[PDB]
Structure formats: structure tokens, C-alpha cells
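#dry-run=false #mode=assembly
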Amino acid sequence: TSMVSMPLYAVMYPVFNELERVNLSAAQTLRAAFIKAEKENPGLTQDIIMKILEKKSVEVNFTESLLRMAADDVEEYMIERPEPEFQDLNEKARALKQILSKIPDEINDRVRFLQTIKDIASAIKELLDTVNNVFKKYQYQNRRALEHQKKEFVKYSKSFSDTLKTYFKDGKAINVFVSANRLIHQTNLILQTFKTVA
Amino acid sequence: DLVQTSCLSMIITPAFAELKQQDENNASRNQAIEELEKSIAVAEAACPGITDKMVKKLIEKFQKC
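#status=ok
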């Protein structure tokens, strides 16, 4: 659940889910083994994915690709509960992640990118407002976890803003992509915390 | 070459050996890599071709974007 372990959840989990359709036992064996290795040495799953891509001559930027896939595999992250407040959280989360996932395509179009930045700030505000509402609605359950995640989110959002400012000076897109992935990870962690309120 | 491709020996083994060479005196990391390769071999013995399918789906995710 650290940032550096994000690719396990974002890339490998969906692959294991698809492999479950081929052979449940084998898929679970692979899943458990990747989980164990990542726990023993955080960052290994990323290194493994990049190495496999290199061996198969897939010439892509890993960070950018991770960002482009941010709106995918919705069922891995969404709160599977029918009440309006969880649906609302899911939708705010999805909206944010969707807008962020389009940065790689929009960043080279200056007029469009300026609008993207405003849409991101709006989606962040609405997510945080909803988080606070549901937090209060369930009487501040999971308090320490949610307060800590909210604090990190605000920190990561400020850091994302700083990264945009710098990008307007130096044009180095990768730094925006890194900072956007962090916000995606923190969005997913907040959703996860609401899975266990009752 | 003509005869013989084995995703595990073709792709995973060399990949993992190269992984270890990124940080050679890292005991905990190398142990983690060794355990994982062993489990991949167990999975491959239970379902021949599963490693190839893992690599294909992995690649597909990145090509499709």
C-alpha cells in the first residue's frame, strides 16, 4: 500500500484476475508469490514489469503508461456497496482519476491543458468534500487512518500544483506524470478506507 | 536456432538474473527474486503455458496503452 508498491495493484492484480479464468490454482499461486515478493522488497514488481517489457521490446514509458491506465479496472478500487454515499465517493474518485488519466494526451495542447488543470482542481475539491461528508455520516469511524490519508492527499495535491508550475517553466512532462500517479494512489487508498465503515 | 523456443527459461530466468545484477550484493532482494521464480515454476508445472499467458497479458496492457 506504499506508493512504490502501486504497480502490483495497478498492473499485476488485473492480470491475475484474467488468469483466474484460465486456471484458478495457478493464478492464485502467481498472485500470492508476487504479493510476498513485493512485501519482502517494495519496488520489485515495478522492476519486474519494466524488465519484462524490455525483454519483449515494448518501448514505452512506464510512468506515463501507468497514468494512462488510471481510469481502468474500476472494480478493483470501487467501494462495492449500494448506498448513495458510497456511490457518490466512487463517482468523485472516478471523475478525478479519469481527468488525471488524460494528462498525457492533453499536456501538449496548451489551451486544453489549462482547462484540464481547472477540472482537476474542481474534481479534487469535490472528492475531498464528499470524503468529509461520508466521514462525518459514519460518525468518524476509521478516524486515524482517514485523517492521515486526508493529510497525505492535501500534501500530494500541493505537490502536484508545484509540479505544474515548474512544468510551465521547464516543459518536462514526466514530473507531472509522476505527481499525478501519486494522487491516483492516494484516491484509491481513501476509497479502501471506506470499505470497512458500518 | 530452429529447434526450441519455454517462457520461463526464455524470458523469466534471464530477466530475473538481470534483475539481480541491478543490485548484486542485496541479500534480501535476491532472496525475494529467488522465491518468486520458484513459485512461478510451481505455477507453470500446475498449468503449462500460464507464464506465457501472464507475460502476454502484461504486454497487452501496455501496448493497448
